[PDB]
């Protein structure tokens with residue numbers, strides 16, 4: 001609370017290497033730190049300034065963290081101080097803390113920096129008694145004893161640290177790597193070019209794998225699972241197999257830490273030599289390096305930064321001389337404070353486990369999803385697939401609703417994974433106008449060839465519903481022999497789904513199972529924390545939001561009022577509102593009354609009249625029937641005549657058919673499989689007498705993100721979890737963020 005951090009001060013620090021998002025962390029850490037009545041102190045140049053001190057520990061204001069969200073790298077500054085790795089230095093830093101009076105320390109760093117603060121919290125007890133032989137009056141130690149709180153905030157493009165689902169910057173890092181391959185990829189038209197990108201990752205194959213999974217890398221090399229035995233043949237057999245199979249380029253991604261069975265490291269150049277000496281294609285190595293850390297932080301990292309930042313400060317002010325070292329982080333999409341020590345002691349475990357040829361233990365300590373990506377990567381990466389028999393179940397996949405960045409990525413694994421099960425996969429053009437009009441084709445392994453990155457809807461998606469035409473579709477699911485349905489779409493996929501169950505009452509054909517994969521820009525589908533195409537949309541809003549915070553204004557001081565899309569769902573606006581640090585984001589799920597709206601302005605003004613020079617006001621395209629854009633606009637204008645200028649922008653639905661970011665391509669790839677695996681089951685389990693009869697509710701689901709796991713939920717079970725008037729779910733997780741979004745704008 002406002003009185004919580006009163007009579008309390010904290011010093012934030014940014015050790016480790018530049019990770020896009022650190023800046024948002026700091027900001028949040030300062031903004032929320034003040035807010036809690038506490039005092040926040042900067043500490044330029046990572047652990048260094050802490051050791052040094054003096055002019056390296058300046059005090060932060062609120063205006064100080066202004067306009068940082070959008071900036072990459074660290075601004076508080078990051079060094080490499082090795083003096084701290086020794087006590088002949090930690091003691092001087094401590095001196096600096098106690099000399100400046102500070103009981104809380106936020107460390108935004110990596111596996112090492114984090115492990116350093118760790119050992120610091122520990123070797124802190126004796127640090128007093130020793131720095132007492134001559135340090136400062138012993139009156140202080142008896143006034144700052146077993147009270148040295150430190151929160152570790154994980155920032156690293158490695159995504160190595162264990163205990164956190166994501167680290168800062170890795171998504172942006174993912175964007176960089178992606179934009180390149182995205183470009184490498186869309187040019188190779190001449191010779192059978194064969195790029196050999198080498199990407200980051202000391203000991204972690206993460207970025208390397210994930211980047212292969214989004215590009216459709218032809219082969220990959222990662223640490224935790226070295227290519228044991230004669231592979232070159234394999235890799236060449238492959239590259240040639242695929243060469244004659246008809247293809248232009250090839251993208252062999254290589255993690256830096258890429259080693260082999262024994263350990264004698266695989267080299268990006270070596271790889272390059274191989275292919276040329278054995279196959280002789282014009283191969284060309286590239287080594288992205290230190291650019292992955294560049295560019296600007298993606299919508300996710302800015303957001304993730306702010307969330308972690310707030311978590312830290314809370315965790316800092318909620319500490320007790322009996323509470324252990326803390327490391328806040330994300331998991332199952334919610335903040336968590338984890339035992340610093342436990343995290344380090346383990347995140348280390350993986351290294352040794354890897355030092356000993358024990359890679360199974362490696363890939364395990366890493367495990368879960370990682371292991372999955374690996375598994376799914378290889379599968380979809382195959383050149384094959386198997387020989388199609390006859391007793392094979394035949395599935396149909398289709399798109400329904402407005403298009404999304406990821407649909408084609410989902411349709412591609414759905415078909416590949418299907419085909420690899422030995423099942424048949426039909427492809428439907430134009431959603432439900434699909435099984436109905438009869439536009440249905442058989443999709444072979446190549447049909448989906450290189451789609452994972454293409455945006456829009458290759459198959460065609462319409463929003464029309466099934467019911468009105470059960471006759472024709474059922475007529476068709478019999479003719480073509482459809483025996484399961486995979487629907488990638490948004491609300492009218494969920495909705496058209498329910499619409500299918502009822503049919504199971506009047507029709508026996510509709511008595512097949514179906515899974516609904518959420519693909520909607522708006523993130524309005526019930527039964528999942530995320531949907532495919534939101535991140536992509538979101539990243540574009542957040543982008544143009546930043547580009548608009550410029551405008552060739554004939555003078556400074558100016559306020560922008562922007563209307564986002566997403567019908568009644570305040571996900572984008574709220575999120576974008578937070579990613580681009582707007583003063584206000586008017587959404588539906590959170591009703592405003594002119595009594596408020598007023599106060600929201602008799603506020604930005606009190607700011608445009610000082611600190612702030614550009615203002616951001618986000619409005620959900622449906623937050624309120626009366627208080628339209630134009631209303632909010634005009635209100636904000638008049639009220640600020642003289643003090644500032646103002647323009648109003650309506651983004652609207654700027655062709656959401658651009659291109660999927662790496663996260664939607666992964667998300668749509670991972671599910672498209674998860675579903676096609678789950679569905680192959682429900683189809684066996686529903687085969688009875690030379691016919692299938694799914695008439696239970698389990699056979700009709702929507703697969704979605706729900707906390708730490710993906711989960712199949714039956715459409716009917718969700719009916720009472722969804723407001724159909726406004727086509728949105730009831731209980732949106734993110735409404736939990738609104739408050740932080742508000743304190744960062746300096747409210748309450």
Ligand SMILES: Nc1ncnc2c1ncn2[C@@H]1O[C@H](COP(=O)(O)OP(=O)(O)OP(=O)(O)O)[C@@H](O)[C@H]1O
Pocket residue numbers: 015016017047048079080081082083084085109110111112113114115116117119156158
């Ligand atoms: N093992 C350690 N013990 C104590 N302090 C450390 C340790 N490792 C790093 N530090 C502190 O952090 C500084 C920078 O370390 P480092 O470059 O490893 O950052 P990091 O958090 O490990 O991120 P990265 O994954 O890029 O290594 C060191 O100079 C020292 O100040």
Ligand SMILES: Nc1ncnc2c1ncn2[C@@H]1O[C@H](COP(=O)(O)OP(=O)(O)OP(=O)(O)O)[C@@H](O)[C@H]1O
Pocket residue numbers: 217218219220221227228234238377378381382383384
């Ligand atoms: N794309 C890939 N990247 C890295 N390793 C791969 C890839 N594809 C297969 N492998 C490796 O090849 C070995 C398994 O071969 P599998 O028998 O699983 O594929 P395959 O049928 O021989 O090849 P294809 O599927 O290219 O004919 C394992 O080491 C597996 O990790």
Ligand SMILES: Nc1ncnc2c1ncn2[C@@H]1O[C@H](COP(=O)(O)OP(=O)(O)O)[C@@H](O)[C@H]1O
Pocket residue numbers: 165166171210300330331332333369370373530535663666667
């Ligand atoms: N861009 C993002 N937007 C929302 N959540 C994200 C994003 N990137 C990662 N996450 C979170 O990271 C965790 C999932 O990581 P993971 O299983 O490795 O999937 P991927 O392999 O797609 O990262 C979840 O908490 C997920 O919500």
